[PDB]
Design a protein around this ligand. Sequence first.
Ligand SMILES: *[C@@H]1O[C@H](CO)[C@@H](O)[C@H](O)[C@H]1NC(C)=O
Ligand SMILES: *[C@@H]1O[C@H](CO)[C@@H](O)[C@H](O)[C@H]1NC(C)=O
Ligand SMILES: *[C@@H]1O[C@H](CO)[C@@H](O)[C@H](O)[C@H]1NC(C)=O
Ligand SMILES: *[C@@H]1O[C@H](CO)[C@@H](O)[C@H](O)[C@H]1NC(C)=O
Ligand SMILES: *[C@@H]1O[C@H](CO)[C@@H](O)[C@H](O)[C@H]1NC(C)=O
Ligand SMILES: *[C@@H]1O[C@H](CO)[C@@H](O)[C@H](O)[C@H]1NC(C)=O
Ligand SMILES: *[C@@H]1O[C@H](CO)[C@@H](O)[C@H](O)[C@H]1NC(C)=O
Ligand SMILES: *[C@@H]1O[C@H](CO)[C@@H](O)[C@H](O)[C@H]1NC(C)=O
Ligand SMILES: *[C@@H]1O[C@H](CO)[C@@H](O)[C@H](O)[C@H]1NC(C)=O
Ligand SMILES: *[C@@H]1O[C@H](CO)[C@@H](O)[C@H](O)[C@H]1NC(C)=O
Ligand SMILES: *[C@@H]1O[C@H](CO)[C@@H](O)[C@H](O)[C@H]1NC(C)=O
Ligand SMILES: *[C@@H]1O[C@H](CO)[C@@H](O)[C@H](O)[C@H]1NC(C)=O
Lengths: 136, 136, 595, 595
Amino acid sequence: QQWFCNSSDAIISYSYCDHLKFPISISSEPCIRLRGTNGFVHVEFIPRGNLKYLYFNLFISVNSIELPKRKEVLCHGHDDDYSFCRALKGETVNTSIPFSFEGILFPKGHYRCVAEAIAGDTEEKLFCLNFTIIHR
Amino acid sequence: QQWFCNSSDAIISYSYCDHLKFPISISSEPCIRLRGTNGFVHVEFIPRGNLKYLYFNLFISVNSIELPKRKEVLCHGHDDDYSFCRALKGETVNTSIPFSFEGILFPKGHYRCVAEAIAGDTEEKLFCLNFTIIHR
Amino acid sequence: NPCIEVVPNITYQCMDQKLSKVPDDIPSSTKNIDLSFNPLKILKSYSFSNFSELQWLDLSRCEIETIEDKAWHGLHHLSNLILTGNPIQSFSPGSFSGLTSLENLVAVETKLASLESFPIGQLITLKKLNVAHNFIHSCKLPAYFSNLTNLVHVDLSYNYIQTITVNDLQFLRENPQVNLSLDMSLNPIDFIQDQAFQGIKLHELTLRGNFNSSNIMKTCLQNLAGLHVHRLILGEFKDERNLEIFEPSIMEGLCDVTIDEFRLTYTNDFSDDIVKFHCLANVSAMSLAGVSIKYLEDVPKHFKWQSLSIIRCQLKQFPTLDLPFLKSLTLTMNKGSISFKKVALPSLSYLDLSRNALSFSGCCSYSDLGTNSLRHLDLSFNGAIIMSANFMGLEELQHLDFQHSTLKRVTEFSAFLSLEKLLYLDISYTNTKIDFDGIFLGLTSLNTLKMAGNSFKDNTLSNVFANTTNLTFLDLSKCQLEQISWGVFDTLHRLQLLNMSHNNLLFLDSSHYNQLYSLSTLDCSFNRIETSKGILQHFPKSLAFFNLTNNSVACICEHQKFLQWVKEQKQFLVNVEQMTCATPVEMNTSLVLDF
Amino acid sequence: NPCIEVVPNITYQCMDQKLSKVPDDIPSSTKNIDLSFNPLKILKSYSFSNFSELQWLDLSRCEIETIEDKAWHGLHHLSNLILTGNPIQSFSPGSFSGLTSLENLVAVETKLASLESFPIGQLITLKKLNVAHNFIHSCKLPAYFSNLTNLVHVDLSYNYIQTITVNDLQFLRENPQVNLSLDMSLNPIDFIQDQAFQGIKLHELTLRGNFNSSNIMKTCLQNLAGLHVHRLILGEFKDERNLEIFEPSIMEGLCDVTIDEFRLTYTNDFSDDIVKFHCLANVSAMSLAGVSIKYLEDVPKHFKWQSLSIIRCQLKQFPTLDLPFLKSLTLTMNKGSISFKKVALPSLSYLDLSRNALSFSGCCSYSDLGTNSLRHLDLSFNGAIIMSANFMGLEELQHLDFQHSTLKRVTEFSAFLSLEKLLYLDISYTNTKIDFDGIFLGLTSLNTLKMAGNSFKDNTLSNVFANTTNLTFLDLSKCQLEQISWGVFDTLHRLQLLNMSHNNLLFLDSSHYNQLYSLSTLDCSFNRIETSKGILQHFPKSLAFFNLTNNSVACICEHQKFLQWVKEQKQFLVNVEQMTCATPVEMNTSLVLDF
Ligand SMILES: *[C@@H]1O[C@H](CO)[C@@H](O)[C@H](O)[C@H]1NC(C)=O
Ligand SMILES: *[C@@H]1O[C@H](CO)[C@@H](O)[C@H](O)[C@H]1NC(C)=O
Ligand SMILES: *[C@@H]1O[C@H](CO)[C@@H](O)[C@H](O)[C@H]1NC(C)=O
Ligand SMILES: *[C@@H]1O[C@H](CO)[C@@H](O)[C@H](O)[C@H]1NC(C)=O
Ligand SMILES: *[C@@H]1O[C@H](CO)[C@@H](O)[C@H](O)[C@H]1NC(C)=O
Ligand SMILES: *[C@@H]1O[C@H](CO)[C@@H](O)[C@H](O)[C@H]1NC(C)=O
Ligand SMILES: *[C@@H]1O[C@H](CO)[C@@H](O)[C@H](O)[C@H]1NC(C)=O
Ligand SMILES: *[C@@H]1O[C@H](CO)[C@@H](O)[C@H](O)[C@H]1NC(C)=O
Ligand SMILES: *[C@@H]1O[C@H](CO)[C@@H](O)[C@H](O)[C@H]1NC(C)=O
Ligand SMILES: *[C@@H]1O[C@H](CO)[C@@H](O)[C@H](O)[C@H]1NC(C)=O
Ligand SMILES: *[C@@H]1O[C@H](CO)[C@@H](O)[C@H](O)[C@H]1NC(C)=O
Ligand SMILES: *[C@@H]1O[C@H](CO)[C@@H](O)[C@H](O)[C@H]1NC(C)=O
């Protein structure tokens, strides 16, 4: 219930999880649209983990029908691409990232996806979030 | 026991089958070798079948160990490549064919293969032959 | 008598018995007899008088040297006559007299010398006429061809023809309305008299294996003019001696002929330069098959091509093309492994890229072809097809086909999401662990679906076919299903077949099958059913077929209601006299059921 | 006390409890405690006097503003100290006094102002020293670095450094025998005083994200001279503002530095022309990772390259190369689908083309590479690899690897027919219906074989492993085998492991296993054995392990000899107290066996 942006064909919102509460500050620019968009995304927080082997788990639900689960490696941990993936515990992290995609045909329904950040070897959830998308 | 050629690294021979006896005259030039060779092969016989959809069945045995069976289409039956694959019953057929291959590594053992010519729709064996190869 | 009957008084197949005379023991009113390799040194009169409905006679390699004055005396319906191999030094007048309705003739290998002394005369009906391998030296078409109001093919191949003169084809100049295809393949032509072809039209010409040197071909191809044709067949055969160098200028003197479909075949010497030679600018249907091409680079835009076809030609790259008039491209059975590349063809309505090991990575969107109005697509027996976008520009299609091709990433999103007009589909034998519902989503019209080899999640049918009303032919076979969830087949109002076999299913129910209004055939075989459980009355009335072979039926004093319902309606089942039952008493076809 | 112990007196993990003091209840002789996010507004003296073997302490975001005169009084073995986040306005003399053996320091985010007033002094051993995110303005290396006879890394990143002067690095001019890697990444450099670097040697330099304009970079890169380095790290990060145009002449003034391994990273603007710029003619180990290349065309022959490495770079074609000195090529994790093409590299001894969707059609002969002396080959996780010839020129190899790749036509002939020197092999999870014997033929030396997922003909092991003596590790798991033929394992004199599990096998025998001299471990699990049938004594003596969990054992008054032999040697089995038996009496762990 912290942040939410209104675009032409999208309503997006997020909120903390129910069994984990660590603060993060995140947002993007501009409010994306469900076709080709270009822009940025800001990030600021405090690690609590080494962030060297960081990835995600995404559990997706397309209008009450489940899908399989998605896992996307974000920082391999060796000669990486980004700058924020070299941080240490208690060291402020602040950055901005560019992005651009194209778009496919998407059904008109109530989506949902839960997204959890996992460390690499001291496996533990750095944070959890509920993402709620409405395509319209 | 009709024909047999002696090459440097090959002994080849053939003979009629045991449950079919229709005459054929076949041979090649020169006596092939188990590496790259170029040459010709002569053919003369009398069809007894339409020869429009002609192919083979080969049952191979490499030193007493069986293999799967081989089937190679030789005349598709529509705008073909060769001339002899347009013949009719009782019409003499006489031709010569060029060929050339390269060679692979072959084990040193007693080979065998039985080769039977099959028509297309009036499925019947036009002839049968025992091929006996010795590689040395 | 001594020959091997196959069907009662039909197909007596009396071949290769040492005979010397037509057999008399043969029962009359037979259909198709067959003689071959039987020595009949002479043929005599009236021998066929008895037979009155024999309508397929063969005679081949039957050594014949003469025919009597009237040997075909009575034959009312004989729509065939083969005569191959029979050496007749010369024919005699008045032969072929008795016949009345003949629709074929094959005088091949006959020691024939000319076409003028051939006593055909008046054979009112004769569809074909085959000739080959004869001692002919001329090419003149005699005049008695005027009466045969139907003859749609002639063949003069493997002959000793040397020249062509203006005198021949004269009958064609006289008759402008005669359909006649033709062939003169394998003829050692070395001269064409000038102004031979003039105001003439055919339906097929064919020349393969004639020429020996380049200049001769130049001159001959030059001598043609004014001609009007419908199909050229040029090429050569891989078992003779032929050309050594092919020049794009050898086919000079071709910018004068009118052509509607050029067709090339296998050639020993070839170059990419042969195509798009400026005398091929109006060929309205290109074609080529067996040609050892390797690349296909830029082609001029001022061409008029309505069709292209490559078959069995090596191609180590997907060629680029740009032709604002081509349609119906076809490439199949290629001898190599390639990878799709974008093209541009502003008006295409047919495509077939099958039985090639083709990998299509960024799959199936508008930009890959840049067109509308596609009608038939087929990528079957190919390799891995990574799905990257659901079909977005191709909003009009009619067929679609994968047969043996590992289709990847089908379940990560709802593919086939925009094919609102479809009438066919085939996902068979593509390993696909269906674990996402709503996969077959968004496609309303679909009157066929074939899902033969496809696993499932924890082996159960689970509410897949929804919003798929119009769907008459369904198929879920050969796939391991250890049970069935409650609620499938809810709305298949129009489903007239349901194949389900070769899967392990201990029992079946009657709570299903409850809403199928019009279901005619229903196979359920090889699936070891023990007994029903429903009311056994709640089936649909419009039901005509079943199939219960190879089922293990509990035969020990239980569920006797089913055990009698099976023993009452033996009309709808099949082989009702062949069921056994699996008891502590085995190896006995016990179908007593005294209860 | 109130914190969450994990291991007895070990890893007390007392994190995020609202504390104000080091806890005293902690049992002494602990190993690794951990405090974090605990408010400790001040730190006091002697607090750690009790603990005497704590060898891993952490303090992070513990709000600290001061340290007492002697707070580390007694600590004999503490090989770590983290101090991140603690804001200390300025350090005090004589600190760090008590410690005696420290092998790390992390003063990051500390409000540090300079490096000269840092009271390290004499810390005889200090392997690393990390610094970052501080208020530093200079770059001078003070002199007390003379005593620390071991310090193999320094970091000064994210600082406010502006220039470089000849005065700095002076200690390096004095000391020619000091190993020290370095880093100054993310430093807004805009001037280098002339003749800064002179007679100097490092072990790693690193500059990523510094420069903003082209001319500035030109001048700076020019000002370097005489330098001697071992690893350059140049590039930029995708989350700042950086260059707009990269010119191959920007890296001018580079033909004077001595280099042994150039290493590039992600760049926004790129061109194929950047490589093979004439100032890269002596770089003896090329490397590049993350660069958005597209093609790699001809490269001059007068280059001295000993290594090349492309990682995670897009490449829409297999590039051609010719370099008579390159070896150890590596290309992995490519982002596209490609197809092998012949190359020439007269001296190569390493290759790795893995996790790319690479199709290798005319497979694996001499002419594809044109070389000898290959040692390590790996085509794993790729796609279809049509076998066309057994390895013929590559008669010397050591490893080989297919992991998830459909390997076609393996059985039509005896592949692997010439690898007389091999020591490893991996055909796993490649669908392969082994129906031809003598497949693993001709390869004598093979000390490993992994055939996890592979079907068989009519589900039986059949005389495959012959003429394969030296073979110690074997593996036939996860594959459906419904019986075992008689005569397998005839000659495996040296086989010290045999995994066989997760397959359906009702009973097992003792006629097998009869010749294995030295077999240590023998898993046979998840395969529902009922009972042995052999003499139950004819096993090998040198046998130490077994595994019989999840087996259905006949427990009804039969084969009691086995039922007692199991109940005698419970030492060699595992979990002997956990076996049950499958009877008409179910749901009971009955291991009574009163017989
Ligand atoms: C994060 O970086 C941005 C870049 O503009 C800067 O404006 C901001 O001050 C930084 N974070 C905070 C807490 O200010
Ligand atoms: C937040 O996510 C959890 C799953 O972790 C879910 O149960 C819950 O319903 C979500 N919150 C809301 C408001 O739906
Ligand atoms: C078959 O063709 C060859 C070609 O030289 C010819 O010599 C031979 O006479 C032909 N067959 C017979 C039976 O002569
Ligand atoms: C000829 O082939 C048959 C198989 O059709 C085989 O049984 C026989 O042994 C062969 N002849 C000889 C001499 O081996
Ligand atoms: C002309 O004869 C050919 C012979 O096959 C036939 O296919 C074609 O249809 C005929 N043309 C017409 C207009 O009937
Ligand atoms: C082809 O021409 C050559 C050279 O003039 C001649 O020797 C040969 O007999 C000719 N062959 C045919 C088939 O005409
Ligand atoms: C059902 O499918 C099986 C699969 O082989 C086939 O053999 C059988 O003929 C089919 N029955 C129909 C279509 O009625
Ligand atoms: C019944 O099943 C058998 C088994 O193959 C099949 O041959 C037959 O065609 C089926 N009959 C019907 C009516 O589907
Ligand atoms: C120099 O220090 C680096 C630091 O990691 C080390 O890797 C390298 O081996 C050292 N050199 C020598 C010769 O010991
Ligand atoms: C880069 O240069 C531009 C133009 O001089 C200047 O506006 C900007 O502040 C500079 N940025 C950095 C990071 O130095
Ligand atoms: C045997 O193979 C199975 C396969 O998953 C594995 O789990 C087990 O650890 C192996 N046992 C060994 C190698 O002793
Ligand atoms: C015995 O099998 C179990 C079942 O997974 C496995 O976990 C264990 O490692 C095996 N033990 C030995 C000694 O191989």
